[PDB]
Design a protein around this ligand. Structure first.
Ligand SMILES: Nc1nc2c(ncn2[C@@H]2O[C@@H]3COP(=O)(O)O[C@H]4[C@@H](O)[C@H](n5cnc6c(=O)[nH]c(N)nc65)O[C@@H]4COP(=O)(O)O[C@H]3[C@H]2O)c(=O)[nH]1
Ligand SMILES: Nc1nc2c(ncn2[C@@H]2O[C@@H]3COP(=O)(O)O[C@H]4[C@@H](O)[C@H](n5cnc6c(=O)[nH]c(N)nc65)O[C@@H]4COP(=O)(O)O[C@H]3[C@H]2O)c(=O)[nH]1
Length: 125
């Protein structure tokens, strides 16, 4: 309840605002994306959400004018109006645009040490 916010996802998720659309079968809907990860996405639940949580969903993100990203995701969970999705497959090109978003959001060398060492608890040592 303090500075732990009960973290359960190894590392945070590049949170930024943008427009996202989800397509499941012959049905499409417009949604706002609240945050994403190199292997997961979070979105808002629209009213026209006429889909079966058991069947897969596809997500398309729109950032730049020439930046169209496509990812295939499945319903992971749903709580308080928001919906989570786990990436099952994503285009090689889309993967790179996500890398670009992560790199730019990263910024550059910094201090706080700890924060930097935190990568230790996950990967790359
Ligand atoms: N089943 C499931 N549900 C998910 C997942 N990701 C998000 N959610 C749901 O969506 C909510 C969005 O987080 P928030 O409350 O705005 O804001 C979050 C966030 O700011 C922080 N937080 C919690 N766990 C983590 C974590 O592992 N990493 C980071 N970076 N922040 C976390 O604490 C706040 C409270 O978290 P919640 O009450 O859980 O609130 C979460 C949770 O109900 C997921 O992978 N699986
Ligand atoms: N970027 C992004 N990715 C998402 C989101 N929701 C789900 N995913 C992806 O799908 C997985 C969901 O696992 P889970 O079986 O729901 O189980 C979750 C859940 O039990 C817990 N967890 C993670 N983050 C939260 C959170 O914010 N709130 C709560 N309450 N639980 C969380 O940790 C587990 C993490 O599972 P993994 O598969 O390792 O990590 C996440 C992540 O890879 C989302 O909103 N954004």
């Amino acid at each position: 309840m303090s500075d732990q916010h009960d973290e359960r996802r190894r590392f945070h998720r590049i949170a930024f605002d943008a427009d996202s659309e989800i397509l499941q079968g012959e049905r499409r809907w417009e949604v706002l994306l609240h945050d994403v990860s190199l292997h997961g996405i979070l979105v808002g639940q629209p009213q026209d959400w006429n889909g079966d949580p058991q069947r897969p969903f596809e997500a398309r993100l729109y950032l730049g004018l020439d930046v169209l990203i496509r990812m295939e995701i499945s319903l992971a969970w749903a709580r308080d109006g928001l919906l989570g999705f786990e990436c099952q497959h994503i285009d090689l090109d889309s993967i790179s645009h996500l890398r670009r978003l992560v790199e730019l959001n990263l910024g550059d060398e910094e201090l706080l040490e700890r924060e930097l060492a935190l990568l230790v608890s996950a990967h790359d040592d």
